[PDB]
Amino acid sequence: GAMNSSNYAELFNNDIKLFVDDTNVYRVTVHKTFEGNVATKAINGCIFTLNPKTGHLFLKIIHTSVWAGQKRLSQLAKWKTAEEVSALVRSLPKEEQPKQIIVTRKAMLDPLEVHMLDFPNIAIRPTELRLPFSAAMSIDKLSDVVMKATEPQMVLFNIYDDWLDRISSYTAFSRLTLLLRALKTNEESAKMILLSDPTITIKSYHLWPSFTDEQWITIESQMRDLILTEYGRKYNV
Amino acid sequence: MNTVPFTSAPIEVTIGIDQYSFNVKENQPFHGIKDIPIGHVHVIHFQHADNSSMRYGYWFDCRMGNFYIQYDPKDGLYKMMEERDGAKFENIVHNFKERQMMVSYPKIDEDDTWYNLTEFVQMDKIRKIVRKDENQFSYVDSSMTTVQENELSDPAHSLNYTVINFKSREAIRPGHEMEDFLDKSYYLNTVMLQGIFKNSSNYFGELQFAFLNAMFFGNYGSSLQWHAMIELICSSATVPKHMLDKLDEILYYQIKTLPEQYSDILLNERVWNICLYSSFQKNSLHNTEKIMENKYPELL
Ligand SMILES: C=CCN(CC=C)C(=O)Cn1ccccc1=O
Ligand SMILES: C=CCN(CC=C)C(=O)Cn1ccccc1=O
Numbered sequence: 001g002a003m004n005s006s007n008y009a010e011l012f013n014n015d016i017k018l019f020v021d022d023t024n025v026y027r028v029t030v031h032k033t034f035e036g037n038v039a040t041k042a043i044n045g046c047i048f049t050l051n052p053k054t055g056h057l058f059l060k061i062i063h064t065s066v067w068a069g070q071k072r073l074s075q076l077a078k079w080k081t082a083e084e085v086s087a088l089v090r091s092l093p094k095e096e097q098p099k100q101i102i103v104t105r106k107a108m109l110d111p112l113e114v115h116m117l118d119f120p121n122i123a124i125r126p127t128e129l130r131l132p133f134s135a136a137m138s139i140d141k142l143s144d145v146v147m148k149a150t151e152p153q154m155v156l157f158n159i160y161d162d163w164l165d166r167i168s169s170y171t172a173f174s175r176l177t178l179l180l181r182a183l184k185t186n187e188e189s190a191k192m193i194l195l196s197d198p199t200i201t202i203k204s205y206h207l208w209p210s211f212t213d214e215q216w217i218t219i220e221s222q223m224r225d226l227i228l229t230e231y232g233r234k235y236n237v
Numbered sequence: 238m239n240t241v242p243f244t245s246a247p248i249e250v251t252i253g254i255d256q257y258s259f260n261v262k263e264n265q266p267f268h269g270i271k272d273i274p275i276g277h278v279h280v281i282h283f284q285h286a287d288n289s290s291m292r293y294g295y296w297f298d299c300r301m302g303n304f305y306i307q308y309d310p311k312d313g314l315y316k317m318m319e320e321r322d323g324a325k326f327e328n329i330v331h332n333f334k335e336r337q338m339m340v341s342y343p344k345i346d347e348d349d350t351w352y353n354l355t356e357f358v359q360m361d362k363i364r365k366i367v368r369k370d371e372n373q374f375s376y377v378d379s380s381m382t383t384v385q386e387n388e389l390s391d392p393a394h395s396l397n398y399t400v401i402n403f404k405s406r407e408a409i410r411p412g413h414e415m416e417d418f419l420d421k422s423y424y425l426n427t428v429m430l431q432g433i434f435k436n437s438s439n440y441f442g443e444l445q446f447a448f449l450n451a452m453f454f455g456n457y458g459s460s461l462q463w464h465a466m467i468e469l470i471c472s473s474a475t476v477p478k479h480m481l482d483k484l485d486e487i488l489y490y491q492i493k494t495l496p497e498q499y500s501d502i503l504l505n506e507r508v509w510n511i512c513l514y515s516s517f518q519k520n521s522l523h524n525t526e527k528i529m530e531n532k533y534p535e536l537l
Contacts, residue, residue, distance in 0.1 A: 079415035110404070114414045117406050 003127035021133035026077035055160035239299035249286035293378035357442035383458035471512035
């Protein structure tokens with residue numbers, strides 16, 4: 001069934017599973033036309049497909065050309081997501097194929113199930129968690145590779161850098177979700193936190209800075225403060 | 238005009254013959270129903286006064302044999318049987334009529350309900366859904382499950398309706414996932430109509446039979462089948478115009494006939510709101526929409 005707080009540790013067992021987030025697949029800027037009407041202009045997007053155990057993000061870049069001449073783009077975006085995820089599963093060796101795919105929004109369930117009919121044994125699951133994966137485009141280099149693409153393109157990389165050398169996948173995912181929740185609630189502040197100390201750099205092949213364990217505790221505390229702050233700035237508390 | 242005699246009525250029972258129902262008291266001198274219109278299938282059905290659980294009954298066509306009802310005290314139910322001795326049967330029936338021990342099927346069709354509910358229902362197709370080939374009539378009851386229900390357990394006693402599943406390989410062409418799931422016309426017209434049913438008459442016949450089993454026996458899997466077959470048409474953008482007009486008539490008389498007090502359990506809110514208000518065919522079922530809105534506006 002659905003994924004919630006009670007069955008949280010299943011994410012880190014040894015059954016291969018993927019989260020799929022479609023919140024950045026279809027992206028637009030809304031603007032006024034010369035006549036004073038409103039129009040949308042699509043910009044490049046991405047499917048966010050993440051193995052939470054290994055950190056493997058199969059980032060599928062969605063070029064604006066895929067929307068050309070198409071109607072009801074928000075509905076097509078869910079089916080395009082499902083088509084790309086199905087194609088990704090088919091491209092993986094049998095022993096790398098997921099046993100479950102968890103979709104972060106319920107509207108993805110039917111499109112993915114229909115595209116995955118060939119894989120009756122892969123469970124397609126919703127979740128009750130409010131995961132912050134929409135903020136993946138607040139990761140500088142990730143936004144840059146998606147906005148530089150001139151054609152459809154796939155980028156496989158570990159969204160947890162080298163963290164698993166030092167911490168468990170449970171802890172890595174908690175850090176990731178905390179960073180992304182912070183970037184979602186106040187991006188400028190969150191990014192200021194991450195870079196304030198220029199002596200801590202980001203490796204050429206890394207998204208996040210090379211913090212020591214002690215510095216991550218500090219960082220992580222500062223991201224919590226931010227999320228509590230913003231929550232007071234929001235609700236006045 | 239044809240007759241279904243009864244050997245006797247040893248147990249108190251409500252008997253129904255199509256949309257008609259009447260009460261027979263324990264050992265009341267009842268010897269069946271006469272004046273049954275030739276040319277239609279019919280269903281004779283039963284609900285024991287002492288156990289309203291298990292409504293059960295028999296689909297039959299009087300052109301296919303001489304049929305009677307006899308209570309079996311071992312199996313505890315009224316059983317249909319065929320009398321092969323034609324002289325013996327006419328004699329029995331003539332005596333029972335002479336003695337006026339038979340209730341009369343009304344010759345008062347004004348509200349043309351039975352023809353309209355069974356227009357496409359054929360006994361030969363019934364006998365393929367209900368497999369029991371030694372008999373010319375078909376037993377159905379409340380509890381019988383469908384082939385599709387058993388996929389999700391006794392097969393001999395199953396309703397073999399045509400399996401419809403909108404999220405199946407049969408329904409969805411590789412490469413047309415979104416197209417085929419949002420517009421089921423391929424599934425309806427090529428897979429089901431051309432491929433399995435052959436023509437719309439056989440499709441409507443199964444749809445009508447499923448509704449009747451849902452209504453007369455509360456058979457839940459038949460109700461699921463009736464709604465599926467409706468939804469497949471309503472969710473197809475491309476449907477022959479003659480099928481839509483006929484569907485509207487079929488559903489009109491089904492809604493007209495449904496007991497007002499059973500609408501809560503035999504009508505699926507989701508399918509009906511979808512079909513009347515969201516589907517491709519939302520504007521093509523005028524009669525059905527008007528009766529639904531005036532009779533069950535709560536559902537909508
Ligand atoms: C740079 C951060 C993560 N990422 C893309 C950035 C958005 C990667 O490609 C990671 N990566 C993996 C193998 C070889 C080179 C390499 O850069
Ligand atoms: C013995 C009478 C049963 N009878 C014909 C059946 C053989 C009916 O019409 C049933 N019926 C239905 C509505 C109102 C009255 C009523 O009698």
